[PDB]
Amino acid sequence: MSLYRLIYSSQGIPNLQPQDLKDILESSQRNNPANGITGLLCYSKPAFLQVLEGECEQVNETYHRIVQDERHHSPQIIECMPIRRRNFEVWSMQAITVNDLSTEQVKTLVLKYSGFTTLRPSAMDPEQCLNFLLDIAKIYEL
Amino acid sequence: MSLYRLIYSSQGIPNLQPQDLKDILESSQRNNPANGITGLLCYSKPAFLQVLEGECEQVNETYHRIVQDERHHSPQIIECMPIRRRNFEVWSMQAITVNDLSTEQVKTLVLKYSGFTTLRPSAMDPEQCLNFLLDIAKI
Amino acid sequence: MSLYRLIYSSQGIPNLQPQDLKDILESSQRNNPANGITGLLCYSKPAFLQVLEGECEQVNETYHRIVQDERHHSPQIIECMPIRRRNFEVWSMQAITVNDLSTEQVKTLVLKYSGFTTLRPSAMDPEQCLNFLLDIAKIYE
Amino acid sequence: MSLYRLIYSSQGIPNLQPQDLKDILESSQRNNPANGITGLLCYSKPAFLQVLEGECEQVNETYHRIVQDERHHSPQIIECMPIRRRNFEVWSMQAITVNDLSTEQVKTLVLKYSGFTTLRPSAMDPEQCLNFLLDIAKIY
Amino acid sequence: MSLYRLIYSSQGIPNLQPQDLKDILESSQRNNPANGITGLLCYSKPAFLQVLEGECEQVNETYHRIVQDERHHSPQIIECMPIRRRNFEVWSMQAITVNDLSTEQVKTLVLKYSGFTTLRPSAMDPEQCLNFLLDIAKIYE
Amino acid sequence: MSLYRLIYSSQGIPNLQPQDLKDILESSQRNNPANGITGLLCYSKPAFLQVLEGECEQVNETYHRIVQDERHHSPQIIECMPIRRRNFEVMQAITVNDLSTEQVKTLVLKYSGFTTLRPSAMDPEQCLNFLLDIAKIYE
Amino acid sequence: MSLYRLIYSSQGIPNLQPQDLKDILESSQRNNPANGITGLLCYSKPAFLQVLEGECEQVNETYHRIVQDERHHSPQIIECMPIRRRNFEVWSMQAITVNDLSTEQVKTLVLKYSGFTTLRPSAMDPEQCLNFLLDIAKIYELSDNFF
Amino acid sequence: MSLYRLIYSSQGIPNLQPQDLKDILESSQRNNPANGITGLLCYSKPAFLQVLEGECEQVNETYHRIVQDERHHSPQIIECMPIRRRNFEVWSMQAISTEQVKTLVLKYSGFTTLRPSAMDPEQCLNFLLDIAKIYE
Amino acid sequence: MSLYRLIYSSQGIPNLQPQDLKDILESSQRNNPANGITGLLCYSKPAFLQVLEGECEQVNETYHRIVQDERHHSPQIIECMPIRRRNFEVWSMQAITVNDLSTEQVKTLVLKYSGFTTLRPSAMDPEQCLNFLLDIAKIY
Amino acid sequence: MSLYRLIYSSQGIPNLQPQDLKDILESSQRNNPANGITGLLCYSKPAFLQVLEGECEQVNETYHRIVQDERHHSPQIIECMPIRRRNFEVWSMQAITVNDLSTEQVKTLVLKYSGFTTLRPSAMDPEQCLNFLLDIAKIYELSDNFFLDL
Ligand SMILES: Cc1cc2nc3c(=O)[nH]c(=O)nc-3n(C[C@H](O)[C@H](O)[C@H](O)COP(=O)(O)O)c2cc1C
Ligand SMILES: Cc1cc2nc3c(=O)[nH]c(=O)nc-3n(C[C@H](O)[C@H](O)[C@H](O)COP(=O)(O)O)c2cc1C
Ligand SMILES: Cc1cc2nc3c(=O)[nH]c(=O)nc-3n(C[C@H](O)[C@H](O)[C@H](O)COP(=O)(O)O)c2cc1C
Ligand SMILES: Cc1cc2nc3c(=O)[nH]c(=O)nc-3n(C[C@H](O)[C@H](O)[C@H](O)COP(=O)(O)O)c2cc1C
Ligand SMILES: Cc1cc2nc3c(=O)[nH]c(=O)nc-3n(C[C@H](O)[C@H](O)[C@H](O)COP(=O)(O)O)c2cc1C
Ligand SMILES: Cc1cc2nc3c(=O)[nH]c(=O)nc-3n(C[C@H](O)[C@H](O)[C@H](O)COP(=O)(O)O)c2cc1C
Ligand SMILES: Cc1cc2nc3c(=O)[nH]c(=O)nc-3n(C[C@H](O)[C@H](O)[C@H](O)COP(=O)(O)O)c2cc1C
Ligand SMILES: Cc1cc2nc3c(=O)[nH]c(=O)nc-3n(C[C@H](O)[C@H](O)[C@H](O)COP(=O)(O)O)c2cc1C
Ligand SMILES: Cc1cc2nc3c(=O)[nH]c(=O)nc-3n(C[C@H](O)[C@H](O)[C@H](O)COP(=O)(O)O)c2cc1C
Ligand SMILES: Cc1cc2nc3c(=O)[nH]c(=O)nc-3n(C[C@H](O)[C@H](O)[C@H](O)COP(=O)(O)O)c2cc1C
């Protein structure tokens, strides 16, 4: 019913290739529009960080389906709450890799909101997660 | 006396034609100026979403007249409260249709405040309804 | 779906007797329960002040039905909004008459939230109506 | 329409007596009920401090009538504003005299909101005025 | 003593001419400098809306003088309070007529803070009055 | 690491029996202490509504273990967030239906639209307040 | 006009005797109540800490009178500002002495608001000074705090 | 060693000549910089109004020195308190026509002549900050 | 000069005996009074949790002298800041050891602010730490 | 885990030449990146004022290592608390000499937050130190002013 946001992180499996993230993105871009789901996925080997926005029932359907995926494990819900309005509404889904090859502007962003230059969501509170995702969206948009 | 704003939604009757939407707009534009009413009507098949601003007595009189209109049914008052100042003061009544022929800019605005690309007032709270309406008035 | 409150006032017909009010109470106490509606009606000749709480769809269904009642006219919605929780949850409906013959305590309460000792709903803001209705529900009344 | 409170002070004519305050009281208690006015009057030689509460129009009517009374001059409105609810509702009007011969508990209240033990409205702000009057009403 | 603002409205007598408002304006612009009074007056037939600023003592002195004026009646104090700083300090007094001949911009402003396009202080709360006066003075300029 | 609270609802299977409720209770009370999980489970046929409290990692492990339970479906997370202190800090379970006391029904009505518990129609604050109030009036 | 509070500290001249302290408090009892001043004087040898509340003009007249007293030097205004209401109550006739033979309760109160068991106003902010003075007035029981 | 602000008013002696104000100016400009005192002294016959900013001990030393000055009497501390930061990066003096100045004295007080006894601390501060702007 | 609080946690060395804890507590109760330090110490093997109150200079000198003690390592400052007033003014130092054991009175407090019944400082933010210590002292 | 900021001041040894400051900056810039530490060091003879930001564990590790440096003594922690985001994230370490030879612009920032034109960290409360440091970081591009002063 109500407009909702869910932020979670997970451990990618050890063997993940760049093609595996193309298969996640394409699936998400195929399923998400029809469900009202918008969002952003960050990968920083081996951690995933994703925000999902949408009707509560749809966000939940999508999350609990994602939890069942064989390409990641130990999902940790970081925040889930009703929202006043969407922030990621221009993307059914988008994917960003944050690594050592990343732009200095991007590295300085990871640091602005966390302890290290490599993204580790398990060490960030919901507001730091949301703000990182907002700012990094802002520099890859659209 | 007191300046008020009422937001409500309703379900248009099934066979609502383009002429129907036009005479609703024409009625509101001739009646509202005289009663101090301003606002915006949005129509998203089959739902209507309207904000009315004016003196409490006038907003109530206007609203209870609209309620009796044969072209819609099941009105749902979403918010009715006194307000500090108007936001739609330049329009006695403005109408927008939000549908599959709407621009990505509109579809995106509907998405920003709700579960889908199609407007469904029943799935929005008062602040979401008002902000959608304020933003769409800002094209 | 969501929990709502609607407060409104109306003008009763000049022809309102003991039996018409009791008929309103009876109808409301019969219909309100099945629809999850709770609240309180006050009658201060000639005015009605009523508060309705419940699911948005129900509140609206009940209100728009009440507006068709020939026993009053010129309904004025005072406030309609989502609420954190109910305050009248114990009564599907109750009806108080507030007038000249009312208790000094009740009179003083009316004066607490308005200009006079006779209840005139069109001279109160939403917070004053609500608090009046909360305090008089507590007295009983 | 709107519920209002008006607080003002004035200078009473030099030699006001218990009886002068008694008929002010009797005048107010007959007039105030029908106008739905409530409130409290303080006299601290030589000055008056009154709060009036009621419908905007009635508060204004009452105040502007009072201004014309011969028993005082130089009225100063301290505060006039809409209010959420009344604080002096049980009293159409009461009068308390506050002087050097008062109770120690009342004297202590004067001191709490002002520079001296004599009540001097002109030397108090709107919040100090209302608060004095609220505490004063509380011990009555 | 303290810096104060008083806002009131009143009813002008039935047939006020532009010359009466000039006289009012001239009287105020001669008396107000010396008393440190500043403010703005609007006339919206038949009503007056004025804001006065100055020392509490002088603001009361001026207001109780104005109230004796035979050119209006039934004065209503809308607000009287201390203030941190003046907003009308550039003008000893200015007078503006707000009626059905004012510009669209002025009419729109009246609508922004009130139920109609004609200015009726009785229909406005103190915040609405103050904001109307700040905004209209800004256009004037 | 961080003290968290998660509130969710779900749909019990149609053939749930009081013995299943007792089995859920036995299991919880065996698993929760060692994991430092506290909270309250409520059952209003066919709906469950649970709040969990404890460390982030343990709330997540317990929640995702619960999601796989075949005695319910369609979980819907209502709120998940860090908290400054526990409210419950003693798993208790309670069933809340149209046979519960007139005291419980009045409590259901206080936070929602009807006398029967329907979490889908309550926001996070109403859910939590309901659970506290229902716990308060029990043990 | 306005209701004011002033808190100040000073350094009493060396070897101030109890009779001098008595002379000061006799003067302050003589003048303060007539001037509508309430407050307290504390003495933690050699330092004075005093609060004065009352009408701005009186608090100032009193303070600038005190400044000229030859029995202390280096006055330091800690705070002076308009207040919404008084927190003392009366002018405390008795001064409080706060030193190393003070009760464990008084010493604990000094420690609650500063770094040590001896009272050093130069180490405290205006709110610490006020709260100390309020708590000590409560224990003595000179005043509290209009109930 | 806390950063502090003190605002006070006083009445200049009836005999105050332009050279007295010049004397005050030159003493303060020699002393204040070495004591880390910034602020502003305004004089409009017969009132002085001054803000001093600096370390507590210096602000107090400077103020109580000023108190002993024979060119004014009846000092009234209007405010004295710790501050988060300074608002005057330098020290200045201004003696107060025209209408801009009229308008300014009015903006934060009841009359068109400067009367500190009728202004609260925030009014005094903002007046002093603004008058530094219309000059200075 | 200024009134400060510092809360820190550290890791005791593997083989601490109850005697060593007495030696720390005795040393602290000997040294703190003269430096104006008050506070509270817990040992939940292996973790130490201490709050130190006092003048900034003394709090720091004591903290840094403590860091050098051979009976713990890895000190983690959790919060350090000026405070309005002390909350532990009555104790030069008190030590809470395994009457952390007190079943669901003290264990009840630990759960109230953290994930488990056993006290682990690294699992608590500054506010949870202070509130725990405040509640624990209250019941003493 | 938690993102933290630590501000402290210490007394530098009376010897310190520009090479010593360079050696300090050099170690910090080599060590800090790996540790996720960022911040700013000011040297106002004889005093240092530093802010460190990073993970609580790493900030603490770095700080207690620094305390053991023979080039200063009497370290005083001014504030240590969790933070919502970094403010000094641009440099692993930036170091600025702030003294009587400083620009009038710098001396004005010093005076804005304290009693005098000479930076004396103990004459400043935590918010004053913080704001002072933020204002300095604002005006200095370059990770130091030892080679060029603006
Ligand atoms: C990190 C991660 C994030 C994912 N995010 C989404 C999502 O945004 N939307 C979605 O439909 N599937 C998402 N999935 C993919 C689904 O788990 C699953 O692969 C998808 O339902 C396959 O559907 P398909 O066969 O139609 O392509 C995600 C998977 C992973 C591992
Ligand atoms: C969704 C909808 C919105 C309407 N909004 C307004 C309105 O804002 N103002 C108005 O006067 N009439 C409004 N009406 C039109 C009235 O229902 C009614 O037809 C009209 O006031 C008739 O006036 P007339 O008979 O003079 O043409 C609305 C009708 C519909 C169904
Ligand atoms: C002032 C007033 C208040 C009323 N309030 C309610 C109400 O709370 N609930 C309700 O069902 N009917 C209420 N009604 C009565 C309805 O108008 C209507 O008569 C009722 O639904 C008739 O149902 P019945 O024919 O089954 O008796 C109210 C009527 C009036 C005049
Ligand atoms: C300070 C003071 C307060 C007064 N307050 C009231 C009042 O509250 N209500 C009122 O009717 N008259 C009040 N008056 C008295 C009126 O001025 C006047 O005497 C009286 O209302 C005349 O009424 P009467 O013709 O019924 O005797 C007050 C007079 C004074 C000087
Ligand atoms: C609505 C209106 C507003 C007025 N405002 C002022 C005012 O601001 N200042 C003033 O001195 N007189 C004002 N007056 C005029 C006075 O009522 C009065 O006639 C005038 O001050 C007489 O003073 P004089 O005899 O010295 O000329 C106003 C009058 C009206 C009716
Ligand atoms: C709606 C519902 C709520 C549950 N809540 C909890 C819980 O609070 N803690 C828990 O350990 N298991 C909970 N479970 C039970 C688990 O799903 C699972 O059956 C159980 O933990 C297995 O433990 P066991 O086999 O060792 O007994 C819940 C199950 C259901 C269906
Ligand atoms: C530390 C100290 C505090 C004082 N406090 C007050 C006081 O609060 N009120 C007062 O009148 N005099 C106070 N005085 C005394 C005055 O300096 C002065 O001696 C007094 O005004 C003399 O009045 P007398 O001539 O009646 O004795 C204080 C003196 C000292 C040194
Ligand atoms: C109203 C007024 C304001 C003053 N302000 C300052 C000041 O800010 N700084 C200062 O050193 N002296 C100020 N003084 C001057 C001192 O009273 C004193 O005369 C001066 O500091 C003596 O220094 P000199 O002996 O070197 O000339 C002020 C004096 C007056 C009357
Ligand atoms: C965890 C812990 C807490 C301590 N707390 C204090 C303290 O609060 N005050 C203190 O003086 N020493 C404290 N110490 C002990 C000092 O490190 C040191 O051993 C002792 O104070 C030296 O004094 P002594 O040689 O006179 O016995 C603490 C030590 C440990 C490891
Ligand atoms: C005031 C001052 C600040 C310092 N700041 C840091 C710092 O931020 N990071 C760091 O690694 N070392 C810092 N140090 C230097 C360390 O104490 C130590 O010399 C260095 O980390 C050892 O690194 P090395 O392997 O190059 O010898 C600082 C030293 C001083 C005296």
mmCIF file of all heavy atoms in Angstrom, chain C residues 103-121:
data_model
loop_
_atom_site.group_PDB
_atom_site.id
_atom_site.type_symbol
_atom_site.label_atom_id
_atom_site.label_comp_id
_atom_site.label_asym_id
_atom_site.label_seq_id
_atom_site.Cartn_x
_atom_site.Cartn_y
_atom_site.Cartn_z
ATOM 1 N N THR C 103 -25.402 21.682 33.469
ATOM 2 C CA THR C 103 -24.600 21.865 34.673
ATOM 3 C C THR C 103 -23.598 23.029 34.591
ATOM 4 O O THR C 103 -23.038 23.296 33.528
ATOM 5 C CB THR C 103 -23.872 20.538 34.982
ATOM 6 O OG1 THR C 103 -24.717 19.724 35.808
ATOM 7 C CG2 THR C 103 -22.594 20.767 35.695
ATOM 8 N N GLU C 104 -23.389 23.713 35.717
ATOM 9 C CA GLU C 104 -22.355 24.740 35.826
ATOM 10 C C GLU C 104 -20.970 24.255 35.367
ATOM 11 O O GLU C 104 -20.245 24.997 34.712
ATOM 12 C CB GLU C 104 -22.279 25.302 37.247
ATOM 13 C CG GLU C 104 -23.373 26.306 37.603
ATOM 14 C CD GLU C 104 -23.264 27.639 36.850
ATOM 15 O OE1 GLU C 104 -22.198 27.923 36.240
ATOM 16 O OE2 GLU C 104 -24.252 28.409 36.877
ATOM 17 N N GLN C 105 -20.615 23.021 35.705
ATOM 18 C CA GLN C 105 -19.362 22.404 35.258
ATOM 19 C C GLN C 105 -19.280 22.310 33.728
ATOM 20 O O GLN C 105 -18.237 22.597 33.151
ATOM 21 C CB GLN C 105 -19.187 21.011 35.898
ATOM 22 C CG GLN C 105 -18.382 20.023 35.059
ATOM 23 C CD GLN C 105 -18.060 18.713 35.768
ATOM 24 O OE1 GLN C 105 -18.943 18.048 36.339
ATOM 25 N NE2 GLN C 105 -16.783 18.324 35.719
ATOM 26 N N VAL C 106 -20.370 21.893 33.086
ATOM 27 C CA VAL C 106 -20.417 21.733 31.633
ATOM 28 C C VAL C 106 -20.343 23.116 30.999
ATOM 29 O O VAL C 106 -19.594 23.334 30.041
ATOM 30 C CB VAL C 106 -21.722 21.030 31.188
ATOM 31 C CG1 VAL C 106 -21.924 21.161 29.685
ATOM 32 C CG2 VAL C 106 -21.731 19.552 31.640
ATOM 33 N N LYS C 107 -21.114 24.055 31.551
ATOM 34 C CA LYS C 107 -21.109 25.412 31.064
ATOM 35 C C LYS C 107 -19.686 25.977 31.083
ATOM 36 O O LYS C 107 -19.224 26.549 30.080
ATOM 37 C CB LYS C 107 -22.065 26.281 31.863
ATOM 38 C CG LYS C 107 -23.531 26.157 31.407
ATOM 39 C CD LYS C 107 -24.449 27.021 32.262
ATOM 40 C CE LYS C 107 -25.880 26.944 31.755
ATOM 41 N NZ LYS C 107 -26.855 27.828 32.507
ATOM 42 N N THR C 108 -18.998 25.785 32.203
ATOM 43 C CA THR C 108 -17.655 26.321 32.409
ATOM 44 C C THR C 108 -16.659 25.710 31.428
ATOM 45 O O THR C 108 -15.729 26.386 30.959
ATOM 46 C CB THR C 108 -17.180 26.108 33.867
ATOM 47 O OG1 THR C 108 -17.962 26.927 34.755
ATOM 48 C CG2 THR C 108 -15.705 26.474 34.019
ATOM 49 N N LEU C 109 -16.870 24.445 31.103
ATOM 50 C CA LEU C 109 -16.097 23.747 30.078
ATOM 51 C C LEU C 109 -16.312 24.357 28.684
ATOM 52 O O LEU C 109 -15.353 24.601 27.948
ATOM 53 C CB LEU C 109 -16.514 22.285 30.056
ATOM 54 C CG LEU C 109 -15.640 21.229 29.399
ATOM 55 C CD1 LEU C 109 -16.494 20.043 29.066
ATOM 56 C CD2 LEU C 109 -14.936 21.716 28.149
ATOM 57 N N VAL C 110 -17.569 24.581 28.308
ATOM 58 C CA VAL C 110 -17.864 25.247 27.047
ATOM 59 C C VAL C 110 -17.127 26.596 26.969
ATOM 60 O O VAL C 110 -16.513 26.911 25.960
ATOM 61 C CB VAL C 110 -19.382 25.424 26.846
ATOM 62 C CG1 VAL C 110 -19.656 26.237 25.614
ATOM 63 C CG2 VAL C 110 -20.062 24.047 26.746
ATOM 64 N N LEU C 111 -17.165 27.364 28.054
ATOM 65 C CA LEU C 111 -16.488 28.657 28.145
ATOM 66 C C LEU C 111 -14.954 28.534 28.061
ATOM 67 O O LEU C 111 -14.275 29.466 27.616
ATOM 68 C CB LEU C 111 -16.873 29.311 29.463
ATOM 69 C CG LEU C 111 -16.930 30.814 29.681
ATOM 70 C CD1 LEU C 111 -17.627 31.540 28.555
ATOM 71 C CD2 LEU C 111 -17.670 31.051 30.966
ATOM 72 N N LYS C 112 -14.416 27.401 28.515
ATOM 73 C CA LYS C 112 -12.973 27.149 28.482
ATOM 74 C C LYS C 112 -12.391 27.187 27.066
ATOM 75 O O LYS C 112 -11.259 27.639 26.871
ATOM 76 C CB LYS C 112 -12.641 25.805 29.113
ATOM 77 C CG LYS C 112 -11.142 25.526 29.246
ATOM 78 C CD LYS C 112 -10.873 24.326 30.107
ATOM 79 C CE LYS C 112 -9.389 24.078 30.195
ATOM 80 N NZ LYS C 112 -9.125 22.648 30.573
ATOM 81 N N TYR C 113 -13.161 26.683 26.104
ATOM 82 C CA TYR C 113 -12.709 26.594 24.720
ATOM 83 C C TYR C 113 -13.492 27.468 23.728
ATOM 84 O O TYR C 113 -13.400 27.265 22.521
ATOM 85 C CB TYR C 113 -12.763 25.145 24.260
ATOM 86 C CG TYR C 113 -11.869 24.216 25.050
ATOM 87 C CD1 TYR C 113 -12.416 23.263 25.899
ATOM 88 C CD2 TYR C 113 -10.488 24.302 24.958
ATOM 89 C CE1 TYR C 113 -11.604 22.406 26.625
ATOM 90 C CE2 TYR C 113 -9.660 23.434 25.684
ATOM 91 C CZ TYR C 113 -10.237 22.493 26.505
ATOM 92 O OH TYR C 113 -9.454 21.638 27.228
ATOM 93 N N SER C 114 -14.257 28.438 24.229
ATOM 94 C CA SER C 114 -15.023 29.311 23.337
ATOM 95 C C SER C 114 -15.415 30.644 23.970
ATOM 96 O O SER C 114 -15.167 30.886 25.158
ATOM 97 C CB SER C 114 -16.278 28.574 22.834
ATOM 98 O OG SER C 114 -17.280 28.492 23.847
ATOM 99 N N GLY C 115 -16.060 31.488 23.168
ATOM 100 C CA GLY C 115 -16.423 32.830 23.576
ATOM 101 C C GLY C 115 -17.576 32.931 24.549
ATOM 102 O O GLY C 115 -17.706 33.929 25.249
ATOM 103 N N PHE C 116 -18.407 31.896 24.611
ATOM 104 C CA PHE C 116 -19.615 31.970 25.425
ATOM 105 C C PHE C 116 -19.894 30.695 26.185
ATOM 106 O O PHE C 116 -19.188 29.716 26.062
ATOM 107 C CB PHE C 116 -20.838 32.357 24.570
ATOM 108 C CG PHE C 116 -20.862 33.809 24.175
ATOM 109 C CD1 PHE C 116 -20.459 34.203 22.903
ATOM 110 C CD2 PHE C 116 -21.264 34.782 25.077
ATOM 111 C CE1 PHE C 116 -20.459 35.541 22.536
ATOM 112 C CE2 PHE C 116 -21.277 36.125 24.714
ATOM 113 C CZ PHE C 116 -20.869 36.501 23.442
ATOM 114 N N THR C 117 -20.956 30.725 26.963
ATOM 115 C CA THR C 117 -21.302 29.626 27.836
ATOM 116 C C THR C 117 -22.260 28.662 27.111
ATOM 117 O O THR C 117 -22.566 27.565 27.623
ATOM 118 C CB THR C 117 -21.892 30.200 29.150
ATOM 119 O OG1 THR C 117 -21.257 29.583 30.281
ATOM 120 C CG2 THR C 117 -23.400 30.066 29.205
ATOM 121 N N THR C 118 -22.715 29.085 25.927
ATOM 122 C CA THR C 118 -23.491 28.241 25.002
ATOM 123 C C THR C 118 -22.588 27.766 23.854
ATOM 124 O O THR C 118 -21.866 28.559 23.245
ATOM 125 C CB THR C 118 -24.773 28.955 24.411
ATOM 126 O OG1 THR C 118 -24.477 29.551 23.138
ATOM 127 C CG2 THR C 118 -25.330 30.011 25.354
ATOM 128 N N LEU C 119 -22.634 26.472 23.558
ATOM 129 C CA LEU C 119 -21.733 25.888 22.573
ATOM 130 C C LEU C 119 -22.093 26.382 21.181
ATOM 131 O O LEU C 119 -23.198 26.146 20.717
ATOM 132 C CB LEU C 119 -21.794 24.350 22.625
ATOM 133 C CG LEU C 119 -20.825 23.561 21.735
ATOM 134 C CD1 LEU C 119 -19.403 23.770 22.212
ATOM 135 C CD2 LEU C 119 -21.186 22.061 21.749
ATOM 136 N N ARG C 120 -21.156 27.073 20.535
ATOM 137 C CA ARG C 120 -21.302 27.482 19.129
ATOM 138 C C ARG C 120 -20.081 27.010 18.334
ATOM 139 O O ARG C 120 -19.052 27.694 18.310
ATOM 140 C CB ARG C 120 -21.500 29.002 18.992
ATOM 141 C CG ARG C 120 -22.731 29.562 19.739
ATOM 142 C CD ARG C 120 -22.855 31.088 19.613
ATOM 143 N NE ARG C 120 -21.587 31.743 19.956
ATOM 144 C CZ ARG C 120 -21.207 32.949 19.530
ATOM 145 N NH1 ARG C 120 -21.997 33.671 18.734
ATOM 146 N NH2 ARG C 120 -20.021 33.431 19.901
ATOM 147 N N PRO C 121 -20.203 25.845 17.661
ATOM 148 C CA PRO C 121 -19.114 25.154 16.964
ATOM 149 C C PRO C 121 -18.464 25.972 15.858
ATOM 150 O O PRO C 121 -17.313 25.724 15.513
ATOM 151 C CB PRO C 121 -19.808 23.946 16.332
ATOM 152 C CG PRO C 121 -21.062 23.775 17.060
ATOM 153 C CD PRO C 121 -21.484 25.133 17.501
#
